[model samples]
Target: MDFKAIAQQTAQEVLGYNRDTSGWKVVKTSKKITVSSKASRKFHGNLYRVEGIIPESPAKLSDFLYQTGDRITWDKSLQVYNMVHRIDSDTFICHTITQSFAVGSISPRDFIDLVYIKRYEGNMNIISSKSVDFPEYPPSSNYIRGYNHPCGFVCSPMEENPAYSKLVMFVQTEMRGKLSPSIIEKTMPSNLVNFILNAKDGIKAHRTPSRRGFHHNSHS
Candidate 1:
């Protein structure tokens, strides 16, 4: 069912949204990470963009962030990950379960998404995902369904220094429940920057001082 089209659209939105940062208000900037948020003709709440530099090449950054199975080990929010359907080498229908935030406040959530990975001419890579219904794995009683709308990370080499890559992330998730605007303003942006810091720590563990290898990928 035209998974490529879905994937391609998500990719374009992420790549487009990152550069289209005119109206976004800078929310947080610390430790080489900068995050912004903006109101849009949106779903759930305000949209966000996160930018940071990773100490690696685009190919290595993609390996760490885009095409790896070790994500569950590093991403604490991700409790379970299952590839539901494989459309091609780089496109798939996948399911993930996120750990509960506040026991009674927010239950554990799951998502079925069409994920697409694309590489551009300038050594840039984008991994985009949007929520979709997968018959094989319907909504379950174990978790509250979460929708990730046009969320992804774009990794590209820094223009002045090709050895380092910059990570641009677009995040918008709808957890269908009662949510206050104050809660969203405080949580999402902070969580994303913390995510980058956590990612840096994870990436640090996978590489040595002299050796170049697996590192740095953003996740929601």
Candidate 2:
């Protein structure tokens, strides 16, 4: 099987309207709505699509995602989040540690991801993340290295409110190790939905009347 081709197809589906939305069950509804569908294969992980409006310009939303420090302030579920180093103008590596959730287990999860971001054009931008290893970012004794599958953001200006952005995120990943399939099915949907809601709240806190300085650093 062509893994790269599959990855490309996944990215395209997230950035465009080609993916079938009919099967997506609404996991949460409010100011920010989230929907998800179970993957056909167990190893494919789950497909999550989140929709939300951030009261900020597309440019500002891009900046917030790159702001490593601001993430800690807004995302309460994170135990650790920091930029490790820059790869280029539009790419970087980062470390993340998330608080543990009840899944018939007691340990939290950590990950090292390489991020690539593109500038907004025609009212939209794309950001994608993939799991990577960095010796400098060794696993913590307290948390297991988590599998970060392909995840990304598709950002566009909300039609009704040009000042705000309509954000959609597609993330497919599994926290490896002893977590069972039954346990995952019981927990993942709500957890994933909560993540989108928390992210919306986080962005709202960082919006400013003036444009925030842009960064070329890699962030997700």
Candidate 3:
């Protein structure tokens, strides 16, 4: 399992200049455009792709997504979040416990993701993430850990528009435990759209001078 190579290949698949967009369907549109296609594995999940033009530089956008302090402000779904380890300047592992939902008696979901970031060409930046099991972050008595499949982001500067960035994000994952598969399928699109929009709004707020110190209320 060559994670670095896998990361690079996934980045190309998601960020390739010649990516095939014909099979993607527009499921939602607002501050960002969200698209989805049926997964190759039948009834497993939907492959989500979200794109938006944000008023920030490629570097700033990259920091906002991977930064812990800035993330908690805009990501309201997380109950607990931490950077478990920093492998180097461009790679790390992180852990999070999401706020309990009605999926299975209000059980909270947790995830540990291994992430890597690197520059593509000159103006583009890519970050890839995948779930990994770590003994140190084992679930306690009350929480159930969820699996996060390979997901990534591609940030590129718009040639015609300076200082603005094009953000493309992809994610595909499923929750374990007793949650009904029907519930996960029905709400996946909404969840993906909300995640994208929240990041968009969060980054915007984070870049603002006044909201620089903004922090949202979290469960714990």
**Each prediction's TM-score against the native?**
0.84, 0.73, 0.77
- Sorted by TM-score, highest first, which candidate order results? 1, 3, 2
| Deviation from truth (RMSD, Å), model 1 | 4.3
Please give the ranking of all candidate structures by lDDT, highest first, separated by commas.
1, 3, 2
Candidate 2's TM-score: 0.73
Q: Listing every candidate in turn, what is its Cα RMSD in Å to the true structure after a full C-alpha superposition?
A: 4.3, 5.6, 3.8
In candidate 2, which residue ranges exceed 4 Å CA deviation? 1-24, 38-44, 103-106, 208-220
Q: C-alpha displacement of 95 in model 1, angstroms?
A: 0.9
**lDDT by residue for model 3 over 125-193, one digit each (tens)?**
877666656564676657666566666677777663347777777666666666675665544555556
Cα RMSD for predicted model 2:
5.6
lDDT of 2 by residue, 80-126 (tens): 67777656665666687776466446477776766666544656665
Which stretches of candidate 3 lie above 4 Å from their native place? 1-10, 13-18, 40-43, 100-106, 210-213, 216-220
Error of 3 at 152 (Å): 1.6
- Backbone N/Cα/C clashes per model: 0, 0, 0
Model 1 weakest lDDT span, ten residues long = 210-219
Model 3 weakest lDDT span, ten residues long: 34-43
